[PDB]
Design a protein around this ligand. Sequence first.
Ligand code: GUN
Ligand code: GUN
Ligand code: ZN
Ligand code: ZN
Lengths: 355, 355
Amino acid sequence: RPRFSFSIAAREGKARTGTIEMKRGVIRTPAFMPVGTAATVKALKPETVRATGADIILGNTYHLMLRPGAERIAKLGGLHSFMGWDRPILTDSGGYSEEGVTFKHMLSPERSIEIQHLLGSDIVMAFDECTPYPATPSRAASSMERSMRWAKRSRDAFDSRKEQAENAALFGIQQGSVFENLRQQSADALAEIGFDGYAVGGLAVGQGQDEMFRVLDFSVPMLPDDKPHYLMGVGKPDDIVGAVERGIDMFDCVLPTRSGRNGQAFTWDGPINIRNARFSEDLKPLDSECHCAVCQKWSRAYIHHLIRAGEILGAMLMTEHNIAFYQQLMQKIRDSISEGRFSQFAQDFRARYFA
Amino acid sequence: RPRFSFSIAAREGKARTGTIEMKRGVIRTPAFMPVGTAATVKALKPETVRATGADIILGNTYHLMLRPGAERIAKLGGLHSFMGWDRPILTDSGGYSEEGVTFKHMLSPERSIEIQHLLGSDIVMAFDECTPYPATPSRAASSMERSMRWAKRSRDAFDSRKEQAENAALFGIQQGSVFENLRQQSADALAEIGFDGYAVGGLAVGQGQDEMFRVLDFSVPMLPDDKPHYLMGVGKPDDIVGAVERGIDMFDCVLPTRSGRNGQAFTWDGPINIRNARFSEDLKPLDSECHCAVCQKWSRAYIHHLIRAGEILGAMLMTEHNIAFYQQLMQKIRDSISEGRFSQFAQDFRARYFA
Ligand SMILES: Nc1nc2[nH]cnc2c(=O)[nH]1
Ligand SMILES: Nc1nc2[nH]cnc2c(=O)[nH]1
Ligand SMILES: [Zn+2]
Ligand SMILES: [Zn+2]
């Protein structure tokens, strides 16, 4: 199988659908990656993550390097073996002095790539220094500047590890805050280095949806058309639909998992908090149309009771439903783009979801 | 199918193995009932409970009557439907004035049986007033005395509800503390009323194993030989082996579940706390011989990490392993009795387990 083969099967406006072929399997795009914080996707066995339709999951470099440690995970066979997920895994770089960052532990592009190496990540993220939003132009470009030099440093460390280069992929991360000119300069630096894919960094904090989207309107066309576009740490179902509309191919977010445990469930008619007393005797499944295991078996009232009682089965069922919903959302986006009816889909989606 | 048909397939000394046939399925005896506190067996889907080998689970009257309430559960279709377990369910009576108990809510034999009725329990427990250990003879028999009058009251309320009597079973509960004479008098009162099965109450608090066992040595032969014998709230794997040796057929306990979440795992070479740093790099499954899903897939080191990190997947895996172990223990006891080699089994078991 290939190391990293991105093919675009269909397009509609700025949106694309297609595949990323890797040694450990294929990734259908647009793709949602469940976040497996601490070598587990909160409350789900990997078999269940797969059942919901996920093709790839995300692991965090910072978290695992501290616990149980990178070299330990390496000695026990690598992250795939350790947690029981044999499909691709993308690791963030740990990022979210010119030499790197010291913390109360040391991180730099070189250490970051060797740690992700030790973890056995399939998709590696370049080490970066996130540009806190907001702002200042000659500040954001300073921050952006180091990032770009760090991307070069990550590229070189990765390529030196030929085991890594032959079997894994390296993604660069675009910074610039909300400055069109800082974003552009980052786009050029990154494409000048050359990466397997390009991420849009810095948009996952503060910025309402309108700001985020306006920044995507000019950022994403700056990226090489022929490589995957990954929007880091986004988002809500309507954020995803809007970002795909602006050319994004990959997503991660803690939303479905975290807000699941908190009692929030995502539905086609919008999110609901299952703790609300209105669900006390509701026999309907969480969502009238979800094909998930949970909605085939349990009612809102049962899940209402488990969550209010702080029962772990509750968190389990809510998280499985929410990841299933996100995956179902990605499948509908994929199908509608391939079929050339994604703009209709986005419209219909918003009407209902916001209704 | 029958309402309640107990058959004894084989015996060895005081021990028996056989079946209890009920409308919703068959119960293999000696039987371990996972405790499904709050309409869930902590951290497990019912399908997983079934996978481990459980034939019946236990629900608590006191807990569910307060949340989400008995009449509500009745309106939503009954406990089986509500929680997604279609096999038998035994409900405790809520027990653990002459008219009943008031609490900061009202409970009496009549209310207890109607609540278990509303829940749709398969096996109903008579309402009792547990004889706190220790003791005083003319006190324990006072407490025992009310219990016996309450058992009569439970018998009558149950039989008046003909929907209940035609489809469910009623168990009486033997009290007496550690007094051989109070136990005997309770045995006679109960058998004079007549129940489908007989429980040994009051032995699940304080009493070390030796005391518990000496009390079983004279209590259990007092019970009708031809009905099931249920030891309430027991216990550790070695407690179960010892009680079966003294004629017990049914068990419940929070041990496998609760101590699972706390990081304790049961093995054939004894319990272990997976949090211990000695498991940090242990690639072995939790138990070298367990046939459970968990031990087929994950290592001690992975589960070590999840539990120390407070990850829900950890509690899930540990609870599934522990319930699987208990069920595997019951199967080995059943097979060895049928095969007439249970005393050898008990011996071999103790050597290893305590080794
Ligand atoms: N490494 C990294 N991770 C993120 N997660 C969300 N935003 C970012 C970012 O800009 N960089
Ligand atoms: N109802 C009841 N439940 C118990 N659980 C443990 N012991 C007892 C008992 O004596 N009565
Ligand atoms: Zn669902
Ligand atoms: Zn096991």
